Design a protein around this nucleic acid. Structure first.
Lengths: 43, 144, 60, 185
RNA sequence: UUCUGACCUAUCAGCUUUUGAUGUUAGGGUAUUGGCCUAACAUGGCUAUGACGGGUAACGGGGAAUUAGAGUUCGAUUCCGGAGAGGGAGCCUGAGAAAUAGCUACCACAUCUAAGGAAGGCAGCAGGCGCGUAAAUUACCCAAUUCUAAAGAAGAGAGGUAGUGACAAGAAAUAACAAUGCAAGGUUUGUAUUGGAAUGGUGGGAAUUUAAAACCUUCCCAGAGUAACAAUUGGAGGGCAAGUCUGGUGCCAGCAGCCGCGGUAAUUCCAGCUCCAAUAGCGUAUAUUAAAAUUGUUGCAGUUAAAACGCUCGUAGUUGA
């Protein structure tokens, strides 16, 4: 058959940890922060 | 009327013509004929338990050429062989030669999907462990 | 005692005398006040020994 | 048998969920009124749609009809009691006239901010959740509580809260500060 | 027992009558009318306004879903009516049962036996097996709700209360705040460091709640700073809200309802980063509705896209100054 090359890319590719990061804002707080971030001045 | 009777007593005609002409639609034919419950292996279920007969590499249609890793499965309940897709590259390797599979429909309700000839079905749990969970974070208990 | 406290709604009964309580009150409310033991209670082992007996095999 | 108690859904998201304009307006509604979810807007939308449907039924019906005058008088009375309608707003075109900010304005967190009990709607939300408000001498922890017109004058801080001066909330920490200071001194 | 009301089928057009089919007469039976049953006499009766068959993943209804209006799909399943209690049949008892935790026989099952004989029926409640993609405890109680009696005080897996329960539904955290530092705006508004107040979950004791116990609420103890007391899912070319972001793979691996991306400087794969959507819920599949004026009464289309019977008469049919 031609079943030889199964699973190739994931095994081929380099795999790195994410690295640690502080817990995200959520909910009303995140939405409020987004609402301030977005809507004043672009640049 | 034009192509329809107006007639006060013509409700009879309107019913009969509607009743005869309704059958021409494909979806209607599939819904009200018995063939649904007969030719389909799953027959009113989303899901069925099967066993893998063959691991196959089906080639994708011409502009999208690839060999797509699939499993030919014999349903335990109704005894019928079907071809089912294995989502995720390393998962065909994960799947056993004699694997006990939970297979589903593949989103098109018995119509063929994408660039895949002969494929209507997808395996979504193997050994009653989630296939997606194994592909995701290598999660749920493997080969217990 | 209600949400946030400081007021409490319930239901009360005041009988004329103790004789009224003994005559026309029933067991659970007396038990709640203080009364001890619901007498002669053992569930369906009773039924079992009864349906075994016909025509004085034993007096139980 | 099954329970004969009723239950009902409060929300739905209209078709085309990636309607840009709708999304942006809703985000501004969340930001402005201190909401946690699009679902909060959707419940307010359901209330407004219920109002619109009732108003349509009333305005489609003629003058001098028993159902129409009974339902209309009842709706207007109820809307006045909720505080949706103004002083001379007593006719069906004002019932149609209602808008989502006005419904949001009836919320307790909005009123707590408005009265100046809290410095922001989101601050007001947390103040209410942390058990510090009272309406007419009744404590309530619900930020989506909809304030009636009479009720508005009767909103204050809970007397059983630490803000109400009954005791500190963190007796342990307050005691620790007193004990440590007395020990050192 | 009257009237009126049904899903699909003509690749089912003649059915029913020996043998009660249809009428009449006479009887008999029944609780009573009744071909309900018998004898005698007629030769009818029913059928395109589709009989007679055949199908149904067919109990019927109140109703459920989606509904702008029509509609379309759905109604084992909380109330009502029917059917049924392994299959048929037959009885007894009694006012009421062709009862099935009544009985008898046969067939289908099937148990103990000392193998002579004996007894049996979960589609009652638990629980088990088989079936399967698929479904909870052999819990406690008659306190309430009602029922049964020689009826108060006894009984009731009827019924209630718990246990298991991300079926569904409502409500609701995952901080708030002031300083500095930073950002823009004329001395305001917006937003990496610190530091005091507030708060439930979590652990305990009561008051309480209760058939009793548990939950709830109330009070009192305990009791967050990375508040580690740790939010997830799926996307970011278009459809379609979000990256001409970083490496690796190189029509391979693979992804992707759909269009598509990948065959060597990949925005679609595999990771990583950031962004975005919804949120204690969100994917996926199958079923079903809208969408669909793509079954069209409202409201379709038939010169060329699918579709005017080759042509004409004509009974039923519909329409008729």
């Amino acid at each position: 058959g031609s079943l030889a090359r199964a699973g190739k890319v994931k095994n081929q590719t380099p795999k790195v940890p994410k690295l640690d990061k502080k817990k995200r804002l959520t909910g009303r707080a995140k939405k409020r922060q987004l609402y301030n971030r977005r809507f004043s001045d672009n640049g | 009327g034009s192509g329809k009777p107006s007639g006060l007593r013509a409700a009879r005609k309107l019913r009969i013509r509607r009743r005869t002409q309704r059958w021409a639609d494909k979806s209607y034919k599939k819904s009200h004929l018995g063939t649904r419950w007969k030719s389909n292996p799953f027959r009113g279920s989303s899901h069925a338990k099967g066993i893998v007969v063959e691991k196959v590499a089906i080639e994708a249609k011409q502009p999208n050429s690839a060999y797509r890793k699939c499993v030919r499965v014999q349903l335990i309940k109704n005894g019928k062989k079907i071809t089912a897709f294995v989502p995720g590259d390393g998962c065909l390797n994960f799947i056993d030669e004699n694997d006990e599979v939970l297979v589903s429909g593949f989103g098109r309700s018995g119509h063929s999907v994408g660039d895949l000839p002969g494929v209507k079905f997808k395996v979504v749990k193997v050994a009653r462990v989630s296939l997606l969970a194994l592909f995701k974070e290598k999660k749920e208990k493997p080969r217990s | 005692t209600l949400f946030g406290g400081g007021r409490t709604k319930g239901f009360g009964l005041i009988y004329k005398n103790v004789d009224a309580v003994k005559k026309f009150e029933k067991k659970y409310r007396l038990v709640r006040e203080g009364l001890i033991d619901k007498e002669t209670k053992a569930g369906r082992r009773a039924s079992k020994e009864l349906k075994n007996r016909r025509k004085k095999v034993r007096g139980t | 048998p099954k329970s004969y108690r009723n239950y009902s859904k409060t929300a739905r998201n209209p078709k085309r969920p990636f309607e840009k304009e709708r999304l942006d307006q809703e985000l501004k509604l969340i930001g402005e009124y201190g909401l946690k979810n699009k679902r909060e807007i959707w419940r307010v939308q359901y209330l407004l749609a219920k109002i619109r449907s009732a108003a349509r039924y009333l305005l489609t019906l003629d003058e001098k009809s028993s159902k129409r005058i009974f339902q209309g008088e009842a709706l207007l009375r109820r809307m006045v009691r909720q505080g949706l309608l103004g002083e001379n707003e007593e006719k069906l075109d004002y019932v149609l006239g209602l808008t989502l900010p006005k419904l949001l304005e009836r919320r307790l967190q909005t009123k707590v901010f408005k009265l100046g009990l809290a410095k922001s709607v989101h601050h007001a939300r947390v103040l209410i959740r942390q058990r510090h408000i009272r309406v007419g001498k009744q404590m309530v922890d619900i930020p989506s509580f909809l304030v009636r017109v009479d009720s508005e004058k009767h909103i204050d801080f809970a007397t059983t809260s630490p803000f109400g001066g009954a005791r500190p909330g963190r007796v342990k920490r307050k005691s620790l500060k007193k004990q440590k200071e007395k020990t050192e001194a």
